[PDB]
């Protein structure tokens, strides 16, 4: 559903 | 590669001389009449004679008359 903020969630503390 | 399909190369061969280093090409060319004797301009001159099919495929021999990388080359 989200455009790009899903990657903002899977890159903040993902590594 | 093939002209239409470009998701897998048909005849992908290496351009390496006796050294194991990947010879970075620089403005190579193809011979006239499609005799597959393509001449590779290395990272600094080194005119390479090469073929594409049979055991002659790949790097055959080098020769120089210069040191810097080859800029232009064709046939007629």
């Amino acid at each position: 559903e989200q455009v790009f903020l899903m990657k903002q969630q899977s890159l903040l503390a993902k590594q | 590669w093939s002209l239409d399909m470009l998701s897998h190369p048909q005849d992908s061969m290496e351009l390496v001389h006796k050294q194991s280093k990947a010879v970075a090409v620089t403005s190579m060319s193809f011979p006239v009449g499609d005799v597959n004797n393509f001449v590779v301009g290395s990272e600094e001159g080194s005119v390479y004679t090469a073929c594409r099919h049979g055991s002659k495929a790949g790097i055959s021999e080098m020769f120089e008359g210069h040191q810097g990388p080859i800029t232009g080359i064709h046939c007629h």
């Binding site: 903002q8 993902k14 590594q15 | 970075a24 290395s42």
Partner: protein, 125 residues
Amino acid sequence: NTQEIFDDWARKVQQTRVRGRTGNVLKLKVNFLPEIITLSKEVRNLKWLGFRVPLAIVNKAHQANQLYPFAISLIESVRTYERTCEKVEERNTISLLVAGLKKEVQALIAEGIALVWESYKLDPY
């Protein structure tokens, strides 16, 4: 005789990831550094004059020799993902038709991001 630049080479070597941005666009990032081109330049320098570049530098080049095309493909995936995420950011009705596909693709993207210095599962990711 720019031998000091050749000394600078040794000094330069003697010197997936993730980082922030400006427009709150957490782009996909590669764990490596843009040094593969410099390693190729080192190879050119070696065949060019026969420098006695440190063996540690040559071995770092060999270390990157087994994982650099993977990194170049990663950089291409990053840039093409940017190329199309901007297109998705353009309109708003795109989500209504791409939502499930977006979730399934982004989950695998995060799984690909999960690689951190691991040549074993680096390639399938």
